[PDB]
Amino acid sequence: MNPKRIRALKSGKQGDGPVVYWMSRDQRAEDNWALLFSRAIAKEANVPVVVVFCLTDEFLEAGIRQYEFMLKGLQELEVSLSRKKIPSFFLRGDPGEKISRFVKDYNAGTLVTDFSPLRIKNQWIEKVISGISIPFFEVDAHNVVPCWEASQKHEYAAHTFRPKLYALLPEFLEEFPELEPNSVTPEVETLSDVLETGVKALLPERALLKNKDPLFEPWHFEPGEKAAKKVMESFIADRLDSYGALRNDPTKNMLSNLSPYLHFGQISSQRVVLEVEKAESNPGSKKAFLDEILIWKEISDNFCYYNPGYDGFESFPSWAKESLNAHRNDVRSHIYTLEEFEAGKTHDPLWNASQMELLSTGKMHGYTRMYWAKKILEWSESPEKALEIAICLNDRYELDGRDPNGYAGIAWSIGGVHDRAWGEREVTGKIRYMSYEGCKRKFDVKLYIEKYS
Ligand SMILES: Cc1cc2nc3c(=O)[nH]c(=O)nc-3n(C[C@H](O)[C@H](O)[C@H](O)COP(=O)(O)OP(=O)(O)OC[C@H]3O[C@@H](n4cnc5c(N)ncnc54)[C@H](O)[C@@H]3O)c2cc1C
DSSP letters spanning 201-259: HHSTT--B-TTS-B---TTSS--SHHHHHHHHHHIIIIISTTHHHHTT-TTS--S---H
Q: Could you tell me which residues are beta bridge partners of residue 113? A: 22, 138
Report the alpha-carbon distance of residue 354 to residue 345 in Å, rounded.
12
The residue whose CA is least distant from atom 48 of ligand 1 is 259
Rounded to the nearest 10 degrees, what angle do helices 297-306 and 404-415 cross at? 80
Pair 346, 352: CB distance under 8 Å:
yes
- Indicate the residue among 141, 170, 197 that finishes a domain: 141
CB 220 within 8 A of CB 363: yes
On whether both 47 and 85 belong to a single domain, the answer is yes
How many angstroms is it from 181 CA to the middle of ligand 1?
34
Long-range contacts of 202-207 (CB under 8 A, 24+ apart): 202/59, 202/60, 202/63, 202/64, 202/67, 203/64, 205/60, 205/63, 206/63, 206/64, 207/63, 207/65, 207/359, 207/397
Q: Comparing C-alpha atoms, which of 19, 21, 23 is closest to residue 55?
A: 23
Ligand 1 atom closest to the CA of 398, numbered from 1: 8
Pocket test for ligand 1, best of 262, 363, 405, 432 (most atoms within 8 A of CB): 405
- 78-109 burial, b at 16+ Cβ within 10 Å, e below that, comes to bebbeeeebbbebbbebbbebbbebbeebebb
C-beta of 401 in contact with ligand 1 (< 6 A): yes
Taking CB atoms within 8 Å and a gap of at least 24, the contacts of 164-170 are 165/294, 165/295, 165/298, 169/144, 169/145, 169/294
- Say yes or no: CB of residue 370 within 6 Å of ligand 1: yes
Q: Same domain, yes or no, for 308 and 331? A: no
Of 107, 125, 141, the residue at which a domain comes to its end is 141
**Total Cβ atoms within 10 A of residue 8:** 9
Alpha helices for 330-382 (secondary structure H): 338-342, 349-361, 366-378
Domain that holds residue 355: 313-453
DSSP string, 18-61: PEEEE-SS---SSS-HHHHHHHHHHHHTT--EEEEEEE-TTGGG
Spatial CB neighbours of 432, under 8 Å, sequence gap ≥ 6: 374, 416, 419, 422
| Cβ–Cβ < 8 Å for 348, 379 | no
Greatest extent of the chain over all pairs of C-alpha atoms, in Å:
69
> Residue 288 in contact with residue 244, Cβ under 8 Å?
yes
- Domain-ending residue, one of 75, 108, 141: 141
**244, 373: one domain:** no
User: How many distinct structural domains can be found in the chain?
Assistant: 3
Q: Is 396 in the pocket of ligand 1 (CB under 6 A)?
A: no
Q: Which residues are annotated as a binding site?
A: 243, 256-259, 292, 363, 369, 394, 400, 405
Is the beta carbon of 242 within 6 A of some atom in ligand 1?
no
State whether 300 and 336 are in the same domain.
no
Residue 400 CB less than 6 A away from ligand 1: yes
Residue of 122, 117, 123 whose CA lies nearest to 151:
117
406 CA → ligand 1 middle, Å: 7
* Resolution, angstroms, 1 dp: 2.5
Same domain, 381 and 244: no
Contact 180, 39 (CB under 8 A): yes
Residues 96, 99, 102, 105, Cα dihedral to 10°: -50
Does residue 73 share a domain with residue 151?
no
Same domain, yes or no: 235 and 307: yes
Same-domain check for residues 281 and 344: no
256 lines ligand 1 (CB under 6 A): yes
Is there a single domain that holds both residue 120 and residue 206? no
Instruction: Classify residue 111 by its DSSP letter.
Output: E
Q: Residues at the annotated binding site for FAD?
A: 243, 256-259, 292, 363, 369, 394, 400, 405
Asked if 156 and 258 sit in the same domain, the reply is yes
Residue 64 and residue 113 share a domain: yes
For ligand 1, the distance from its centroid to the CA atom of residue 100, given in whole angstroms, is 34
- How far is residue 410's CA from residue 431's CA, in Å, rounded to a whole number? 12
Method: X-ray
- The residue nearest atom 26 of ligand 1, judged by CA position, is 257
| C-alpha 366 – ligand 1 centre gap (Å) | 6
User: CA 293 to CA 298: how far, in whole Å?
Assistant: 8
Q: Which of the listed residues 116, 143, 367, 369 should we mutate to test ligand 1's pocket, taking the one with most ligand atoms within 8 A of CB? A: 369
Identify the CA nearest to 40 among candidates 168, 137, 147, 142.
Answer: 137
Q: CA 359 to CA 85: how far, in whole Å?
A: 40
What contacts 196, CB < 8 A, 6 or more positions away? none
Q: What distance in angstroms lies between residue 81's CA and the mean position of ligand 1's atoms?
A: 29
- 445 and 297 in a common domain: no
> How are strands ordered across the β-sheet holding 110-114?
6-10, 136-139, 110-114, 19-22, 49-55, 88-92
Number of residues that make up the chain: 453
Q: Which residues contact 250 (CB under 8 A, 6 or more apart)?
A: 354, 357, 365, 367, 368, 443, 448
| First-to-last C-alpha distance (Å) of the chain | 51
Closest CA to 254 of 238, 269, 266: 238
- CA 170 vs. chain centroid, Å, equals 25
